C-alpha cells in the first residue's frame, strides 16, 4: 500500500539557459526568436508591392522612356529597388533633395498621374517637339521624359511664358520640373543673353539664374538639366514663369494619406502571400516578438535583436532517471 | 527542493500531466496526473509567455534612411539610434529570458513540493514517509482510498 508523488519527464533534448546554470535540459521550451525567412518579397497585407526593376525612383518619377511599365501603377504597399536600378535620369542632372523626395514617396499607394499643362493646349509659339536626345534613347531613336516638356525659342527667338496651376484635386500634389543649363548653345537654343526661371508658391519660394558650362559629357551630353520637385497643398497655387531654360512639367502626381509604408533594396522575386512584416531577405511572421533576420524591416514587425536563440522554458527539469 | 532533489526522478510513463501520483494499492498500479495543479500550472506558464509576447507593443515602421555624401554626421547619428535600441532590446531579452527561465523551473519545483506537502497534510498517521517522496499506508487501502487522497478528501488520520 504505497502512493508516490512525482513529476513529468520525457525523451526531450531541448536545453534552456537560466541565470544560475547552463544548458538545462527541460521537458518543453518555446522559442521567442524568428530566424527563418525564405525569400519571398511578399505582398504584405493586401497591396501588392511595386518593383521598379531596372529603374529607380528617379527614372520612375521623371518618366524616363526606359521606365514605361511603371506608368500603370496607381497603388503599391511598398516600393522595391534592385541592384540593377540605374535607369534614372538619361539627360543627366542634380535631382535636388532626392533623399527628401524618396522619404516623402514613403506614404501609401496614392497616385493619380494627371495632366496640368497638356502638351498642345497651353504653349503658343513654343517648340513642343524638340524634346529629344541620344540620351533618352527609346531603343536608339531620340526621345525625352514622359512627365516633363522641353520648350525652345523657335530656333531664333524665345518669347515669354507664365502658366499658373491651382490645386483642385483635394490631395497633396507632387510637382516636378527642371531648369536647363545649356552661349554656343544658349544663344542658339533659346537665343537670350539673359534668362531666368521663377517658381513661386505659398510654400516653395525661389528663382534660378541658369548656368553656362562645358560640363564633362554623360551620354554624349555637355549641357544638363537640374530636376526639381515640391509638394502643393489643397487649394494653394503654384506659379511658373521664365524668359529661358524652363524644362516645363507635363503631368504630375496627386498623392493622398492613409496607411504609410516604406521603400526597400533587395533582389528577390515577388510571389503571392501576405505578411505583417517584410525584410530585404524575405517575409516572416509577426507572432514571436523578436527577430535576428535583418534590421531593415517594413510593417508590424518583431524587434531586431543581435541574439542567436531565445529559448524560454515552459516545462521543468527533464530528469528521466 | 523537489525537482533534482529527494524526488530524484521524473515519470516517463506519465504523459497526461506535469504533476501527479503513483498508487500501489494491492488492487492495481499505475500513474495518474493530478489535473487541478496541472491546469493551474499551464494557465500560469501560458499567461507568462503570452504576457512576454503581448506587452511588446509594435506599430508600422520602416528603418531605412538615405543620407547623402555630405550627411555623414546624421548617418552615424541614425546608426547610434538603431544600434542603441539593438543593444537595449538584446539586453532586456537575454536577461528577461534567463530570469524567467529560472523562475519557471522553481515554479514547477515549488508546485511539486506543494503537492507532496498537500498529501502529507492528509496522511499524517496512516503513512510512513519514504525519502524518494513516496508514502506507505499503515492501514489497508482499497481502490478508492487511493482516490479520496487524490481529490483532497482523505478520512480519519
Amino acid at each position, epitope marked *: 500500500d504505497t502512493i508516490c508523488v512525482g513529476y513529468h519527464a520525457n525523451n*526531450s533534448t531541448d536545453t534552456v539557459d537560466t541565470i544560475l546554470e547552463k544548458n538545462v535540459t527541460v521537458t518543453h521550451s518555446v522559442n521567442l526568436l524568428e530566424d527563418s525567412h525564405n525569400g519571398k518579397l511578399c505582398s504584405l497585407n493586401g497591396k501588392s508591392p511595386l518593383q521598379l526593376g531596372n529603374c529607380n525612383v528617379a527614372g520612375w518619377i521623371l518618366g524616363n522612356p526606359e521606365c514605361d511599365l511603371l506608368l500603370t501603377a496607381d497603388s503599391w504597399s511598398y516600393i522595391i529597388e534592385t541592384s540593377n536600378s540605374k535607369n534614372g535620369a538619361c539627360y543627366p542632372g542634380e535631382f535636388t533633395d532626392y533623399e527628401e523626395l524618396r522619404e516623402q514617396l514613403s506614404t501609401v499607394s496614392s497616385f493619380e498621374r494627371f495632366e496640368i499643362f497638356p502638351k498642345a493646349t497651353s504653349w503658343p509659339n513654343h517648340d513642343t517637339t524638340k524634346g529629344t536626345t541620344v540620351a533618352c534613347s527609346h531603343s536608339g531613336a531620340k526621345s525625352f521624359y514622359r512627365n516633363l516638356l522641353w520648350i525652345v525659342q523657335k530656333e531664333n527667338s524665345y518669347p515669354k511664358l507664365s502658366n499658373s496651376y491651382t490645386n483642385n484635386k483635394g490631395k497633396r500634389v507632387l510637382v516636378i520640373w527642371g531648369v536647363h543649363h545649356p552661349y554656343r548653345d544658349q544663344q542658339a537654343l533659346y537665343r537670350n543673353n539673359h534668362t531666368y526661371v521663377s517658381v513661386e508658391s505659398s510654400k516653395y519660394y525661389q528663382r534660378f539664374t541658369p548656368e553656362i558650362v562645358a560640363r564633362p559629357k554623360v551620354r554624349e551630353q555637355a549641357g544638363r538639366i537640374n530636376y526639381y520637385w515640391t509638394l502643393l497643398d489643397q487649394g494653394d497655387t503654384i506659379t511658373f514663369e521664365a524668359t529661358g531654360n524652363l524644362i516645363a512639367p507635363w503631368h504630375a502626381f496627386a498623392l493622398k494619406k492613409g496607411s504609410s509604408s516604406g521603400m526597400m533594396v533587395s533582389d528577390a522575386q515577388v510571389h503571392n502571400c501576405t505578411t505583417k512584416c517584410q525584410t530585404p531577405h524575405g517575409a516572416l511572421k509577426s*507572432n514571436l516578438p523578436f527577430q535576428n533576420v535583418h534590421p531593415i524591416t517594413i510593417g508590424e514587425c518583431p524587434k531586431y535583436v543581435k541574439s542567436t536563440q531565445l529559448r524560454m522554458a515552459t516545462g521543468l527539469r527533464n530528469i528521466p532517471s | 527542493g523537489a525537482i533534482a532533489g529527494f524526488i530524484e526522478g521524473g515519470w516517463t510513463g506519465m*504523459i497526461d*500531466g506535469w504533476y501527479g501520483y503513483h498508487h500501489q494499492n494491492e488492487h*492495481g498500479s*499505475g500513474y495518474a496526473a493530478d489535473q487541478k495543479s496541472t491546469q493551474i500550472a499551464i494557465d500560469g506558464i501560458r499567461n507568462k509567455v503570452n504576457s512576454v509576447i503581448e506587452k511588446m507593443n509594435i506599430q508600422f515602421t520602416s528603418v531605412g534612411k538615405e543620407f547623402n555624401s555630405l550627411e555623414k554626421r546624421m548617418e552615424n547619428l541614425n546608426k547610434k539610434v538603431d544600434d542603441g535600441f539593438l543593444d537595449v532590446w538584446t539586453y532586456n531579452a537575454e536577461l528577461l529570458i534567463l530570469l524567467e527561465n529560472e523562475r519557471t523551473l522553481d515554479y514547477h519545483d515549488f508546485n511539486v513540493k506543494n503537492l507532496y506537502e498537500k498529501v502529507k497534510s492528509q496522511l499524517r498517521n496512516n503513512a510512513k514517509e519514504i525519502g524518494n517522496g513516496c508514502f506507505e499506508f499503515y492501514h489497508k487501502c482499497d481502490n478508492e482510498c487511493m482516490e479520496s487522497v487524490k481529490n483532497g478528501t482523505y478520512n480519519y488520520p
Partner: antibody
Amino acid sequence: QVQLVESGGGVVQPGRSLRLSCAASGFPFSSYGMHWVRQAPGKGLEWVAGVSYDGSYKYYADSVKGRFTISRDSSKSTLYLQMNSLRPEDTAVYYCARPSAIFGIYIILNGLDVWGQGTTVTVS
Amino acid sequence: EIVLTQSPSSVSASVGDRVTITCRATQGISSWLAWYQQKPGKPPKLLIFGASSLQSGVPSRFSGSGSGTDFTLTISSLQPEDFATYFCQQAHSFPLTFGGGTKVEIK
C-alpha cells in the same frame, strides 16, 4: 497525412445496440486521450465520451452514463464507441476527436485538434 | 455544469467587415476556450486554442480574446471561404461544453 477515420453509423431501432469506431492515422494514438463528440442533428456539438491514454480512467456524459461504453485498442490503434440501450435522443452525427497536445504533455482536457469525417447515427 | 452562451446567435455581413462574436460561461474557465469553424456537413477545424493562441496555418485575421469570465472571437477582414458556423469550447473540466452556434450569412 494525419487524420481519423470513422465508421459504424447506420440505421438502428430504439432499445438495441451498435458499435462505432475511429481508426487513427499519422500520430501516436496510444499517447493521447481521445473523445467522442456528437452533433445532434439540428443542434450543436454535444460531448458524449472521452478516455485517457491507457484506458483506465474513462469520462462520460450524464446522459449516457451506464448506457454507453468507450474503449480503445493499442494493437489496432482504434477507438471503440459501444452503444447500448439506444433511443432517438441518441440520434446524432457522431465525431471522433483528438484533444490537443500542449507544451510537453498530452493532456486529456483541452481543445480538440483533429476530427473524423462524421458518421451519422439515425434512430427511428 | 458550465453553460456557454454565444452572442449574437447569427449575423450577416459583407466581405471586409470587422466581425465580433462572444463566448460566455459561468465558472472560472481561465483561458480554456477553443473556437471552431464549421461548414455544413463538414467536421470542425480548431481555430483558436487557449482563447488567444492562433492555430498553426490559420490566417492571422482570426483572433481570440477574453479571460475567465468574458470571451470574444474577433475576425478582422472576412473572406468568402470564412462563411461558416462557429462554435466555442469549454475545456476547464469535464464535461466539455459547446455553444449554440454563431453563423455568418451573406449580406
